[PDB]
Ligand binder design. Structure first.
Ligand SMILES: [Ca+2]
Ligand SMILES: [Ca+2]
Ligand SMILES: [Ca+2]
Ligand SMILES: [Ca+2]
Ligand SMILES: [Ca+2]
Ligand SMILES: [Ca+2]
Ligand SMILES: [Ca+2]
Ligand SMILES: [Ca+2]
Ligand SMILES: [Ca+2]
Ligand SMILES: [Cl-]
Ligand SMILES: [Cl-]
Lengths: 154, 154, 154
């Protein structure tokens, strides 16, 4: 009895592992994940950068990062409105880096940006990045609430 | 050693339940659940109140109930049409109560509502409530089909 | 303690099956699954027919098949653009059948279709079927990429 029951429960567990994997695949498909490509998701909520970062982390993802003009456009389509990107110069002013580390290999800065402007009156300069109309980028205060868009691996 | 095999399987179960929790969080996120806020969702199907209660119950949720103007708007945006709210005055005519218990603490009645006539016995008249396009409330028969919207805890 | 632990593990497993079923049910609901009706999902990706078949198959579903007017409208609703249907005449030119077997019954052909056209130049005639924006059908080359739409059981 005991060992037979144990061997079965082992099979039951493996079966559930398989079903959950299938469930995740179906969910990814329904969320718009294209075959073999990274995908973006949002709940359309606006919040400060630290909050977006913490939320995406909780979902085992990261703040959306465009690596080319295609993904940049993709992020816009998902967000609809301006959203934070996983890029900041919080560590060293003027040196933007991906929140996952490393220098930028692609950028789409609006003319005259980034400028670390203080005039937004929120205190401090601007160490965060968000997409604006036309898909261009602007550095803004990490305190401003922008649409949370998380990214998940291809 | 069966005790070791048992211990390993218990560990496997905990890993799976953690992954399922993650799957659930990501799904809610993808469907618009805001941080710290209740999650409202619909399949856009119209049915009698009794069917809505059973359906939401089967999903471990309840018929949507707006406790404030913000939530009222969130429900309105999810339904996009006329949908039932988890509120009824079946015990005492005119005294609306939440299906989950308690007296109303917020309402958004249309000027001439509720307009149910007095004197109806059990099941007679208008003892159910539905929200409309603009977010206003109307009382109506629980047998009339309206959009099913369920809510899940924050 | 061994037998007590095994009993608990059995309960842990069944509660996991229960919660997984709940996740699948809520997901279907959020995707618009109507009670007692099969539902449709798409990631909005366009690909050749063979890729759609394989993709839906991996998800435990199949290429969407409109069995009546209602399902046809539901499919164009989810697709929002031209998509393949699970109907072809690969087995016998001129006589269509469902990818899951059986002769085609309900159809919504555009005037002068199907015509097994060779003018497209991709080589061969047209053995696949796709629905257009207005919901009408046309037979086209299985080699052409169209939106991937899967259906899952009622
Ligand atoms: Ca079994
Ligand atoms: Ca800066
Ligand atoms: Ca700036
Ligand atoms: Ca009454
Ligand atoms: Ca009444
Ligand atoms: Ca009324
Ligand atoms: Ca336990
Ligand atoms: Ca043909
Ligand atoms: Ca044709
Ligand atoms: Cl800042
Ligand atoms: Cl063909």
């Amino acid at each position: 009895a005991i060992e037979v029951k144990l061997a079965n429960m082992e099979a039951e567990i493996n079966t559930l592992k398989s079903k959950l994997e299938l469930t995740n695949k179906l969910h990814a498909f329904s969320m718009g994940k294209k075959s073999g490509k990274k995908f973006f998701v949002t709940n359309h909520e606006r919040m400060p950068f630290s909050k977006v970062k913490a939320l995406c982390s909780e979902l085992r993802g990261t703040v959306a990062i465009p690596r080319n003009a295609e993904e940049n456009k993709a992020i816009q389509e998902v967000a609809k409105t301006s959203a934070f990107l996983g890029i900041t110069d919080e560590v060293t002013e003027g040196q933007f880096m991906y929140v996952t580390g490393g220098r930028l290999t692609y950028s789409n800065w609006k003319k005259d940006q980034p400028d670390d402007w203080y005039g937004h009156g929120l205190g401090g300069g601007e160490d965060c990045v968000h997409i604006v109309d036309n898909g261009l980028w602007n550095d803004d205060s990490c305190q401003r609430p922008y649409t949370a868009v998380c990214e998940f691996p291809a």
